[PDB]
Amino acid sequence: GITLGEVFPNFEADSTIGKLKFHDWLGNSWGVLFSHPRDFTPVSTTELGRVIQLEGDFKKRGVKLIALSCDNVADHKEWSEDVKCLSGVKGDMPYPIIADETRELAVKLGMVDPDERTSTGMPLTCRAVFIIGPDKKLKLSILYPATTGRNFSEILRVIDSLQLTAQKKVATPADWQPGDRCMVVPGVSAEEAKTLFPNMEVKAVPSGKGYLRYTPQPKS
């Protein structure tokens, strides 16, 4: 498995764009790698279709997208046409699909589905998402089972928080949406906030501590 802040593997893999080396492919960029159990399956088709719908939203954020399953590349290409059909968007695939036929990555990234296997007993991946920063380090992840399609707007929501909190000295509260007030991190001193967050609110709390601090979301 991979824990937060680990450098993500500079793996080599075949895909729908040919063989790639992960750190080469990603470059100096945010990236999202996500997996699905099996090509030509229904939930997986709605998900890769949804990602097509949202591809300008990822592009606006400088976020490279890459899909993965344990199927071969020829199946990725043929299935891709079904994915396009269901997205309702016409055009080439806006992202590659890795073929993890050896289960190398499935195992290394701790993303084997607990329930879905080939008829032959081969593991398959679950619906994993890994958010990787331009530093190549793992920033956030989710492991959802095959039974449960993902919420891709939550992925974009958290890409928004992660890009903001990367540059500014805030953290985003429960249920935060882009443009909403943020929390000032406990590290910022009163004296430095005077200048940095001149309209900060300190909400009194029964403990008498001064940590419950809100500020408008900084421009970034």
What would the x/- binding string for a second copy be over residues 39 to 78, using CB under 8 A?
-xxxx-xxx-xx---------------------------x
Q: Does 38 bind a second copy (CB under 8 A)?
A: yes
Task: Candidates 10, 74, 81, 220: give the one binding a second copy (CB under 8 A).
Answer: 81
Which one among 85, 117, 190, 220 touches a second copy, defined by CB under 8 A?
85
For residue 32, state whether it binds a second copy (rule: CB under 8 A): no
Query: Residue 141 contacts by C-beta under 8 Å, 6 or more apart in sequence?
Result: 2, 4, 128, 129, 130, 131
193 contacts a second copy (rule: CB under 8 A): no
Give the nearer residue to a second copy in terms of CB position, either 12 or 56: 56
By CB under 8 A, residue 35 contacts a second copy:
no
| Residue 101 or 160 with smaller CB distance to a second copy | 160
Give the interface segment with a second copy, choosing from 11-19, 21-29, 56-64, 205-213 (CB under 8 A): 205-213
Between CA 35 and CA 2 the distance in angstroms is: 15
Using rule CB under 8 A, residue 134 touches a second copy: no
Amino acid type, 192:
E
Residue 111 near residue 143, CB atoms below 8 Å: yes
CB of 19 to a second copy, least distance (A): 25
Q: Does 190 bind a second copy (CB under 8 A)?
A: no
Crossing angle of helices 42-53/152-167, nearest 10°? 50
How many residues line the site for a second copy (CB under 8 A)? 72
Tell me the C-alpha to C-alpha distance, in Å, between residue 150 and each of 136, 145, 156.
23, 9, 12
User: Helix crossing, 73-87 with 42-53: angle to 10°?
Assistant: 70
CA distance to 174, 197, 199, 211, per residue, from 184 (Å): 14, 8, 11, 8
- At its nearest, how many Å lie between a second copy and the CB of residue 204? 9
Q: Which residues of 75-93 are buried (b: 16+ CB within 10 A; e: fewer)?
A: ebeebbeebbebbeeeeeb
Q: Which stretch binds a second copy (CB under 8 A): 21-29, 95-103, 172-180, 191-199?
A: 172-180
Which pair of tokens denotes residue 219? Answer: 């421009």
Q: Decide whether 28 or 167 has the Cβ nearer to a second copy.
A: 167
Q: Does 16 bind a second copy (CB under 8 A)?
A: no
Residue (6 or 192) nearer to a second copy, CB: 6
